[PDB]
């Protein structure tokens, strides 16, 4: 509803509309999803486009995207996205990201891992030295 919120939605739209032609195609959607560790079928991509495509021209313009984003988005600002990402990453909900939870996230998002890379990511974020990443430590890594 705020321009702060609309601008943040506009930035996300720009991540799907790579060619900048003001529309998201089934091809652009699949491209993004295949970079995110997903493997959608054509039928799945078509089903997701039709559900959002209000005028029925077969692509998603910014007004259609904004409508979709407004229904079940929350605040959807830079801080809120970092919080929702932490809540997904903290699988057991204790308020700490463990090495096993980070491995699960990397696998989920299509990122190749090693124990040494995970150990180094925890080491560089772990301000209080408890061997896990809390919300404050996660923020500091992400904002900066």
């Amino acid at each position: 509803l705020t321009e702060e919120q609309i601008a943040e939605f506009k930035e996300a739209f720009s991540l799907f509309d790579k060619d900048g032609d003001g529309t998201i195609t089934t091809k652009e959607l699949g491209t993004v999803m295949r970079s995110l560790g997903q493997n959608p079928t054509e039928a799945e991509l078509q089903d997701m486009i039709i559900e959002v495509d209000a005028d029925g021209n077969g692509t998603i313009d910014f007004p259609e995207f904004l409508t979709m984003m407004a229904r079940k988005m929350k605040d959807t600002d830079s801080e809120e996205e970092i919080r929702e990402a932490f809540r997904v990453f903290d699988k057991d909900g204790n308020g700490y990201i463990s090495a096993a939870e980070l491995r699960h996230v990397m696998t989920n998002l299509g990122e190749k891992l090693t124990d040494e890379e995970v150990d180094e990511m925890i080491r560089e974020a772990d301000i209080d030295g408890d061997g896990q990443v809390n919300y404050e430590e996660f923020v500091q890594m992400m904002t900066a």
């Binding site: 995110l36 486009i49 299509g110 180094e120 992400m142």
Partner: peptide
């Protein structure tokens, strides 16, 4: 590497958008 933390945030933001479709 901080870059990989950033990569994970950017990827998770995109998955959160994909889930609204």
């Amino acid at each position: 590497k901080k870059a990989v933390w950033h990569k994970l945030l950017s990827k998770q933001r995109k998955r959160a958008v994909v889930a609204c479709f």
